[PDB]
Design a protein around this ligand. Structure first.
Ligand SMILES: [Cl-]
Ligand SMILES: [Cl-]
Ligand SMILES: [Cl-]
Ligand SMILES: [Mg+2]
Ligand SMILES: [Mg+2]
Ligand SMILES: [Rb+]
Ligand SMILES: [Rb+]
Ligand SMILES: [Rb+]
Length: 136
RNA sequence: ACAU
DNA sequence: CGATGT
């Protein structure tokens, strides 16, 4: 219904899917970039969407912040809720890095607590999420 | 179909 | 147009 402006927004950017994956988190109110992950040579859109949310959880917990996180990814929100990223991406030598990060993100979720609400950004009503990369 |  | 997902 209403944007919660006091929040963190996250998004993935990619060159190909599967392809080069990066992600970032921004203050929804101001657009200030709060974190950015160095590009990962091969991953999927949904792995990056998932990593971005988990990184946001870790970022907010470290700072004792109760702000919610917005993501536009139905898939990644569900994977975080389940603590399991059900990616189809083949596990091989070239995908080792993204899968290591996904595995470590799941491991963190399984060993830590948080109350952070993870909210769906309503792109159809509100336009692109504020963490968007201008690239489609 | 919906979300990317 | 293609791929990733529920
Ligand atoms: Cl990560
Ligand atoms: Cl909330
Ligand atoms: Cl959702
Ligand atoms: Mg997105
Ligand atoms: Mg985007
Ligand atoms: Rb803390
Ligand atoms: Rb984009
Ligand atoms: Rb599809």
């Amino acid at each position: 219904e209403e944007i919660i402006w006091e929040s963190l927004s996250v998004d993935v950017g990619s060159q190909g899917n599967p392809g080069i994956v990066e992600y970032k988190g921004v203050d929804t109110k101001t657009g200030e970039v709060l974190f950015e992950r160095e590009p990962i040579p091969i991953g999927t859109n949904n792995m990056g969407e998932f990593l971005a949310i988990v990184h946001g959880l870790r970022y907010l917990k470290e700072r004792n912040s109760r702000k919610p996180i917005y993501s536009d990814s139905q898939t990644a929100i569900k994977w975080v809720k389940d603590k399991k990223a059900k990616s189809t991406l083949v596990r091989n030598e070239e995908t080792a890095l993204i899968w290591k990060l996904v595995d470590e993100a799941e491991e963190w979720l399984n060993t830590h607590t948080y109350e952070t609400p993870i909210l769906k950004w309503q792109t159809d009503k509100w336009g692109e999420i504020k963490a968007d990369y201008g690239r489609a």
